[PDB]
Amino acid sequence: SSSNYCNQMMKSRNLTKDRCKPVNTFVHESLADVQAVCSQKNVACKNGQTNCYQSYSTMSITDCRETGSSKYPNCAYKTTQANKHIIVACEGNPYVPVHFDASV
């Protein structure tokens, strides 16, 4: 519940105001550069469907994962920063990211 980036951003973005979400990834890239991944390398999603795409380059990402001691209302996260390729599932028109499948 106290001031590291993940506790702060999970609350501000309305992920932990009414529950503790176990994991979430934030991508520190411009929205249009993340939207550009939907026309990059097509791959299978973890679920086997094929509307997933992997970024050609690594992107700056922060992984937020609940500690073993986190309990609503006191959600607590471990913050891990990394540069990884992201895999997103895309839908619609415009064909835009709707789910974050993984980082690699």
């Binding site: 309305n14 991508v27 709707v98 789910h99 974050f100």
Partner: peptide, 15 residues
């Protein structure tokens, strides 16, 4: 209310 694309942005983009 929020589309799936809007929800992705709110939950995962921090430009």
């Amino acid at each position: 209310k929020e589309t799936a694309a809007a929800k992705f942005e709110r939950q995962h983009i921090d430009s």
